[PDB]
Structure 1
Amino acid sequence: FVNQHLCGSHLVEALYLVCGERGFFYTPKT
């Protein structure tokens, strides 16, 4: 739903900060 869609966008930006140069894997998969 729209909530989780808006939330995912903040998750990806936190992952970007957290993981730094490691990078990361974003998967919305349940």
Structure 2
Amino acid sequence: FVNQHLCGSHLVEALYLVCGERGFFVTPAT
């Protein structure tokens, strides 16, 4: 793993990678 600023799509990707199938859930952004 690489420590960086995570923001935008980098964040959701990092979460999909770190949590796997039990990834986070976000309602539709508007």
CA RMSD of aligned residues (A): 7.2
TM (norm. structure 1) is: 0.45
Q: Would you tell me which structure has more helix in proportion to its own residues?
A: 1
Extract unaligned runs of 5+ from structure 2. none
Q: Would you tell me which structure has more strand in proportion to its own residues?
A: 1
Higher relative contact order (CA 8 A, sep 6+): 1
Aligned length: 30
Identity of aligned residues (%): 93
Following TM superposition, where does structure 1 have runs of at least 4 consecutive aligned residues deviating by more than 4 angstroms?
Answer: 1-6, 27-30
Extract unaligned runs of 5+ from structure 1. none
